[PDB]
Design a protein around this ligand. Structure first.
Ligand SMILES: CC(C)c1ccc(O)c(=O)c(O)c1
Ligand SMILES: [Mn+2]
Ligand SMILES: [Mn+2]
Lengths: 552, 409
């Protein structure tokens, strides 16, 4: 009652959810009128006259096999029809983001959403009906008076009201740190044990004076502080091995609770790949939908399950010291990094996988790692860490100065921990004097996919090769490959393929395409390689010669 | 007070707030606490689903953090203003000196349509999500918004009238939070007029706009397309020449490469010196001529986006080209440098983007959409760290290495 209700609107142009009630058993109804009668007493819900026009389906089921019946409301049509709210930063606070405070206390505010009032004008859209047993009497109609569970607005509206409540206790104690994440309220401070407990007593009364029952404890174990899944100790935090459900038939409402878990664990644990299990699951709603995973999902859940099997430990943040990030090269598009302030006292350890694409090279991947780490750090600590990277300063210089793109890494120092990242081949800027000049070209016939790939040189040397099931783009890379094969250590190579030039001017050092790779290797074996380009069919010699040889 | 709305049938801006350093978050909290006290902004609840990013920057020179809201999305969703909107002075570019002044501060004096306030929501992020977002919405003309200078138009005219009548020959263009003052006076008096114009505003009604961003449009140079001039060419030189002239034949139909290619008859070593024939020499001459007159037909069209491509040329050099239709360049330049071995490619590019957007405002009265030679993830990460303008242009990211880099010198 003391709290100011938030104003809520159904989406524009939409009307309230009129739904039909599913008939129930005398045993499910009797209970309900029970669960309800109590609820109506706390003022959580009211009985509506005969006259409201909206309705929501009411269901009732078990809570343990130690059988009892709890209440379930199907807020599906209403969640579609209710104004969008601002989930704010559906971000997840990292334990290593917490600083060392002396005294800590975790208050589990959960029961409080029932305790927040619902906009008086919107309560009429939450009307539900308790069916009558032989339908000899009119059902019983309740509407909600508090943030109803299962609805769109209870999450954000309450988490918001909370803030307003705390924002005055927070302003009064500039030294005490308070963080709220769902159920959980973390209270930190540097106070003695016994001044802390005192303030906690004021916070508790202050919350009560705003009309919400704080729960204090009913089973009281220790200082291992439990705050939204983390084990908080005086000078270190721990995340216990996560136990993922083991089952026969996966459901869409247990697979959804999985990705959420995986996500949460995603920023605590390294290499937690969840992209396959999300593409089976989104936007498809179920009365009757039940899913087999795909054998690329029982194997992933295999890998995740193996990683979540080991505990995670880390230290807290000491703002007085530098933040350090160290990365090593792991393989198959994999990289490992550790962020710390004091050597061997890690704040966060993680893993980066390469971003999907046909061609790539180690340098672009490292850079991508740095920017991922950089952004993660800024979110958790508000600053950018210094980088210890496995790449010579000379290598990086050669790279960014020559690369056709703009690129940058933050302050960083070289760390010699093999395998070191490097440049395997380097195209020349000018022609090579004394080298053979290989004008190359290719062609293919879309109808038959039959084509040829050849080359001619200033030394008379020449070669064309018939090919099957190939393409024009394929044949020009094939022609280059041939040129690299039959040439000495140094070589000039004129082409007319803008496509082939694109791939090589990107300087890749692995492609998931066999051909490119073959060229890549061939390049790695060369001492000097000058790759030119000319316009097709304009009469430049030896572009024309070879065109004539491969065209027909 | 003025009634504003979104374009018909579209909902407002819901963009996500990117992470901010601790330093920046602190400055934004200060600035917003003040603004809330002065009644400019007001905390909002969760029933407001919109959001616009927000970060902080230091200007050309100040001690001071300036709150910059990225209204790009709300701008293109805000009904263009005609029932008003501003005219661009083609004379501005022709002036000897143009100084830019931040009058944005003045926009805060006009109330914003009650019903339009919600669409201006923004959130100050908290480090490590300790606290959930502090959320506000404007109750006034927000800087960085386009509907702002549009509504403060009548008010801005009335304030400049005395300066206009007495000082009739300066040109004054208002773009977003910016006022472009151009004149053919000498820097001494030019800057006296400015300070005079300054005093005018302080007297006629964050806080600093003391500074002058002075440019010199009359001295901005376009880079033409040129061809080498050598006493001995190689197969390679000729091959390059022909590839480029063939490219320049897409802009100038009069180009001929016949007599040049004819020099490459057979299959020679790239490093072989090939003497120039009379036929070739002439064709080269004739082409050289054509490449120096302007493109046949390129007048600027106001109802179309401007497009800018940039090409990292190495050694801190950069070339760019603005156009609306391909091969119909309105302008082409070469942004030589900061002066040296500028070790932050990303910084150089960010400086280049701003300079180009400046030149664009002066010349056409609007910002161009950019095609940036960078990995989206590298730009999104670091760009706000070198930004000094009060406006933000639209950009995309070029992933494919262009061949035109080899031709725009
Ligand atoms: C003139 C067109 C059909 C063309 C395009 C691209 C090539 O790589 C060629 O080799 C070619 O011979 C012709
Ligand atoms: Mn070809
Ligand atoms: Mn060909």
């Amino acid at each position: 009652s003391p709290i100011e209700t938030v104003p809520v609107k159904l989406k524009p142009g939409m009307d309230g959810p009129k739904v039909k009630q599913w008939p129930l058993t005398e045993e499910k109804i009797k209970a309900l009128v029970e669960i309800c009668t109590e609820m109506e007493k706390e003022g959580k819900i009211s009985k509506i006259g005969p006259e409201n026009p909206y309705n929501t389906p009411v269901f009732a089921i078990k809570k343990k096999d130690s059988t009892k019946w709890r209440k379930l409301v199907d807020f599906r049509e209403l969640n579609k029809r209710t104004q969008d709210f601002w989930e704010v930063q559906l971000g997840i606070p990292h334990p290593a983001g917490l600083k060392k405070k002396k005294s800590v206390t975790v208050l589990d505010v959960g029961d409080a959403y029932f305790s927040v009032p619902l906009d008086e004008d919107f309560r009429k859209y939450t009307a539900f009906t308790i069916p009558s047993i032989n339908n000899e009497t009119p059902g019983i109609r309740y509407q909600y008076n508090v943030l109803p569970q299962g609805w769109k607005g209870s999450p954000a509206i309450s988490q918001s009201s909370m803030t307003k409540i705390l924002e005055p206790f927070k302003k009064q104690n500039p030294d005490i740190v308070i963080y709220q994440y769902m159920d959980d309220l973390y209270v930190g401070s540097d106070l003695e044990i016994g001044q802390h407990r005192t303030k906690i007593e004021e916070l508790r009364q202050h919350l009560l004076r705003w009309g919400l029952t704080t729960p204090d404890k009913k089973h009281q174990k220790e200082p291992p502080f439990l705050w939204m899944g983390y084990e908080l100790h005086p000078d270190k935090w721990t995340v216990q091995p996560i136990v993922l459900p083991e089952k026969d038939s996966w459901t869409v409402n247990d697979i959804q609770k999985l990705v959420g878990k995986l996500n949460w664990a995603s920023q605590i644990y390294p290499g937690i790949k969840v992209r396959q299990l999300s593409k089976l699951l989104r936007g498809t709603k179920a009365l009757t939908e039940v899913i087999p995973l795909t054998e690329e999902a029982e194997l992933e859940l295999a890998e995740n399950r193996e990683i979540l099997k080991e505990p995670v430990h880390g230290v807290y943040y000491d703002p007085s010291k530098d933040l350090i990030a160290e990365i090593q090269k792991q393989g198959q598009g994999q990289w490992t990094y550790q962020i710390y302030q004091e050597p061997f006292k890690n704040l966060k350890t993680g893993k980066y996988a390469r971003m999907r694409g046909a061609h790539t090279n180690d340098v672009k991947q490292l850079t991508e790692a740095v920017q991922k780490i950089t952004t993660e750090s800024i979110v958790i600590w508000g600053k950018t860490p210094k980088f210890k990277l496995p790449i010579q300063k000379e290598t990086w210089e050669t790279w960014w100065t020559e690369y056709w793109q703009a690129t940058w890494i933050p302050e960083w120092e070289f760390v010699n921990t093999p395998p070191l990242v490097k440049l395997w081949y380097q195209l020349e800027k000018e022609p090579i004097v004394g080298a053979e000049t290989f004008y190359v070209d290719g062609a293919a016939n879309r109808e038959t996919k039959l084509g040829k790939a050849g080359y001619v040189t200033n030394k008379g040397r020449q070669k064309v090769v018939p090919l099957t099931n190939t393409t024009n783009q394929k044949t020009e890379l094939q022609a280059i490959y041939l040129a690299l094969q039959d040439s000495g250590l140094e070589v000039n190579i004129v082409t007319d393929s803008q496509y082939a030039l694109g791939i090589i001017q990107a300087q890749p050092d692995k492609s998931e395409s066999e051909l490119v790779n073959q060229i890549i290797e061939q390049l790695i074996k060369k001492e000097k390689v000058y790759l030119a380009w000319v316009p097709a069919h304009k009469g430049i010699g030896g572009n024309e010669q070879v065109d004539k040889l491969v065209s027909a | 007070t003025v009634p504003v709305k979104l374009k018909p049938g579209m909902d407002g801006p819901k963009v996500k707030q990117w992470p901010l350093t601790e330093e920046k978050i602190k400055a934004l909290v200060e600035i917003c606490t003040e603004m809330e006290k002065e009644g400019k902004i007001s905390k909002i609840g969760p029933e407001n689903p919109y959001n616009t990013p927000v970060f902080a920057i230091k200007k050309k020179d100040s001690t001071k953090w300036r709150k910059l809201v990225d209204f790009r999305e709300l701008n293109k969703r805000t009904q263009d203003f005609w029932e008003l909107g501003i005219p661009h002075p083609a004379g501005l570019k022709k002036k000897k000196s143009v100084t830019v002044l931040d009058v944005g501060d003045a926009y805060f004096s006009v109330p914003l349509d009650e019903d339009f306030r919600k669409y201006t929501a923004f959130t100050i992020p908290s480090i490590n999500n300790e606290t959930p977002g502090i959320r506000y919405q404007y109750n006034v003309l927000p800087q960085g918004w386009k509907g702002s200078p549009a509504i403060f138009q009548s008010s801005m005219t009335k304030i400049l009238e005395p300066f206009k009548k007495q000082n009739p020959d300066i040109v004054i263009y208002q773009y977003m939070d910016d006022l472009y003052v151009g004149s053919d006076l000498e820097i001494g008096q030019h800057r006296t007029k400015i300070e005079e114009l300054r005093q005018h505003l302080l007297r006629w009604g964050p806080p600093f706009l003391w500074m002058g961003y002075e440019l010199h449009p009359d001295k901005w140079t376009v880079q033409p397309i040129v061809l080498p001039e050598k006493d001995s060419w190689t197969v390679n030189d000729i091959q390059k020449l022909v590839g480029k002239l063939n490219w320049a034949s897409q802009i100038y139909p009069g180009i001929k490469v016949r007599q040049l290619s004819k020099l490459l008859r057979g299959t020679k070593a790239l490093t072989e010196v090939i003497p120039l024939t009379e036929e070739a020499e002439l064709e080269l001459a004739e082409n050289r001529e054509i490449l120096k007159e302007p493109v046949h037909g390129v007048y600027y069209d106001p109802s179309k986006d401007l497009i800018a491509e940039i090409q990292k040329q190495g050694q801190g050099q950069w070339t760019y080209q603005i156009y609306q239709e391909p091969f119909k360049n309105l302008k082409t330049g070469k942004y030589a440098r900061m002066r040296g071995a500028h070790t932050n490619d990303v910084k150089q590019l960010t400086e280049a983007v701003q300079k180009i957007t400046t030149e664009s405002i002066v010349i056409w009265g609007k910002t161009p959409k950019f095609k940036l030679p960078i990995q989206k993830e590298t730009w999104e990460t670091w760009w706000t760290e070198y930004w000094q303008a009060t406006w933000i242009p639209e950009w995309e990211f070029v992933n494919t290495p262009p061949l035109v880099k080899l031709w725009y010198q």
